[PDB]
Ligand binder design. Sequence first.
Ligand SMILES: [Mg+2]
Ligand SMILES: [Mg+2]
Ligand SMILES: [Mg+2]
Ligand SMILES: [Mg+2]
Ligand SMILES: [Mg+2]
Ligand SMILES: [Mg+2]
Ligand SMILES: [Mg+2]
Ligand SMILES: [Mg+2]
Ligand SMILES: [Mg+2]
Ligand SMILES: [Mg+2]
Ligand SMILES: [Mg+2]
Ligand SMILES: [Mg+2]
Ligand SMILES: [Mg+2]
Ligand SMILES: [Mg+2]
Ligand SMILES: [Mg+2]
Ligand SMILES: [Mg+2]
Ligand SMILES: [Mg+2]
Ligand SMILES: [Mg+2]
Ligand SMILES: [Mg+2]
Ligand SMILES: [Mg+2]
Lengths: 66, 116, 70, 153
Amino acid sequence: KFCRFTAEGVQEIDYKDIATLKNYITESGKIVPSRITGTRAKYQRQLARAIKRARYLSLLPYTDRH
Amino acid sequence: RKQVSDGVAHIHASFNNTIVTITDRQGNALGWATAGGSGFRGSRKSTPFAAQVAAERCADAVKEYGIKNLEVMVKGPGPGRESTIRALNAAGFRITNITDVTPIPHGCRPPKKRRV
Amino acid sequence: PVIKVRENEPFDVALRRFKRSCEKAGVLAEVRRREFYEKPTTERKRAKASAVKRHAKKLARENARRTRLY
Amino acid sequence: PRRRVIGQRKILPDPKFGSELLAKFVNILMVDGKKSTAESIVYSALETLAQRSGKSELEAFEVALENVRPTVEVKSRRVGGSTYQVPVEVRPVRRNALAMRWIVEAARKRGDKSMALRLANELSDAAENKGTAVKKREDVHRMAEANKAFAHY
RNA sequence: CUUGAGUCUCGUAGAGGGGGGUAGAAUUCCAGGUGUAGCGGUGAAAUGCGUAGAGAUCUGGAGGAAUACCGGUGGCGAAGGCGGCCCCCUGGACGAAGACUGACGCUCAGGUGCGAAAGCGUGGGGAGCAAACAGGAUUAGAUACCCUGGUAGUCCACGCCGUAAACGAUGUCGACUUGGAGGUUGUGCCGGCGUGGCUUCCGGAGCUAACGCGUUAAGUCGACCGCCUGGGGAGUACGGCCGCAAGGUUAAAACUCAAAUGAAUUGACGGGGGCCCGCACAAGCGGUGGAGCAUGUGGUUUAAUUCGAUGCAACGCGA
Ligand SMILES: [Mg+2]
Ligand SMILES: [Mg+2]
Ligand SMILES: [Mg+2]
Ligand SMILES: [Mg+2]
Ligand SMILES: [Mg+2]
Ligand SMILES: [Mg+2]
Ligand SMILES: [Mg+2]
Ligand SMILES: [Mg+2]
Ligand SMILES: [Mg+2]
Ligand SMILES: [Mg+2]
Ligand SMILES: [Mg+2]
Ligand SMILES: [Mg+2]
Ligand SMILES: [Mg+2]
Ligand SMILES: [Mg+2]
Ligand SMILES: [Mg+2]
Ligand SMILES: [Mg+2]
Ligand SMILES: [Mg+2]
Ligand SMILES: [Mg+2]
Ligand SMILES: [Mg+2]
Ligand SMILES: [Mg+2]
């Protein structure tokens, strides 16, 4: 488990932080469930909100078959 | 007529049939074979063995192009997904890649459920 | 599920890597679910029925540790 | 049956050639419990089969079995109301049982007069892939090829 | 007067709502390239599509509609409902520390508003799906189920309709009455110790006809409202009101029955599930059904063709 955003006192997940964001998407570009990454429900919503913002700016891929 | 030595095998594995198309890397189809055209009709057509025979004929059908290595793009849920890839390796192609390209809407309304 | 056949990997292990990579992505699970329209009423019932049984099995297993068979 | 409990029944070996294989052939040929009658037919066919190829009494019967023994057959099975014929590998003991049975029923429906000769002509025909038994073998094998797709439950 | 009710200050989470914009995937179609004989569909088929070049694959374009993953007996909303991302307008809930008002409250017939889907009107749009419809099957028949297509509709704007198993089949408000395990969202003090809101399951007393409910009560009580009085006839007729219509709403009676009903119990049954068995299948061998005759029966005939047995379990049976 160990939601790392609660342990590091995060306040926003900042879609620009691609190094952090790529740890929560699979090889095919899909958001990983909080049941797998142990993220707490509050930050998982911010995490998904951040990832969809980075996908729009092409900082992250929607799929692996682009 | 023309030599290539670098092809892509598109396996189209549906529940009812398997279509094997060997294209060149720019997508120009060199040859193709289907399970339905291999002498398998109806129930036989949807079998991994029939899809295997389809790959054997598509390897023969693109023989004069001298293809040495091949990429494998598998599309669809049908029984002849993995059956076709082993038959393409068995024919004598060196498989460079195996990728899934099955389309997923992120879409249109699917047809209504069958009441059988 | 993209697989690159790496250097000095036999085919059978490389093909096993492909089937495993496809199941993690759930491509076959997603395809079968999308071939027929699922009413919102039924997609919510199957969602509720899945949770209700996974909860009951968790409860009914825990008291199995509290009970002997012989 | 629903419970395996089928220890076979010892079978004495052919009195003349001491061949446990050939005793079963007599048993397959036998009618009405008339074993003495069947052994005479088998013995007079084997001598005729031997002196027609000169090989020997026993392995002339063995080389005919080779062309009749199946290696694969279909078993019935229904899936959606329709019947799926599933090819299945014949085990070694049943390969001999089918070979002997095919030869005898191939012989029985022949035009020769005496079954002794009538059998030897079939055992001779199978020696070069010509008779009805080898025809009945190739008919089984092609169906196991036509139905080869269904080799899984 | 301040405890009920409300106002203010700081923050929190949220698919709450209305407007606008935009992204990626996918389907379809259009044009072009490669290519050649099938594709599609089914339990199996056929209708259909294809040598006028399909399907497959690639390139570019058009268009509509829905937002995979996240996603969660998670969240928000009075309910109906609400899900990509961004902006604009806007509603509510909640928490901490106080300040303020000073019963300003609760409930609510009539009335007003909101209210899924289908449907109606006017004008757009139309990819996919798909009532109607057409064909192919299946079938004794098949106004179906299945297949191939396919129009209204589904989408947008504005208006109407006002009904749903609109369900927690559980009116709203307030108080009190053992616990356990979670979810979600604040907050205080030092992962621990508390304290609030909402929510899921289990369970005690109690209650219940039982099933079950059980601090989110179906427990113990108080305030107000709605509704019921056997089944059918019937939420029907007539009338009124409402609606463009479809219809909604309010709402009988004659007549008829002696029950209708709820919950649980024991069986039996299921084209429910699980586990077993049996010449039950499977694997084999020999028969019967054809022939002649023997024998029994049915029927017919007769003066009488004595009576009885007459699915399995009568018919070389009483005999
Ligand atoms: Mg369909
Ligand atoms: Mg009120
Ligand atoms: Mg009223
Ligand atoms: Mg509508
Ligand atoms: Mg309209
Ligand atoms: Mg119009
Ligand atoms: Mg249809
Ligand atoms: Mg009603
Ligand atoms: Mg409900
Ligand atoms: Mg009601
Ligand atoms: Mg309970
Ligand atoms: Mg009425
Ligand atoms: Mg009226
Ligand atoms: Mg049998
Ligand atoms: Mg007879
Ligand atoms: Mg009588
Ligand atoms: Mg009597
Ligand atoms: Mg009688
Ligand atoms: Mg009896
Ligand atoms: Mg008897």
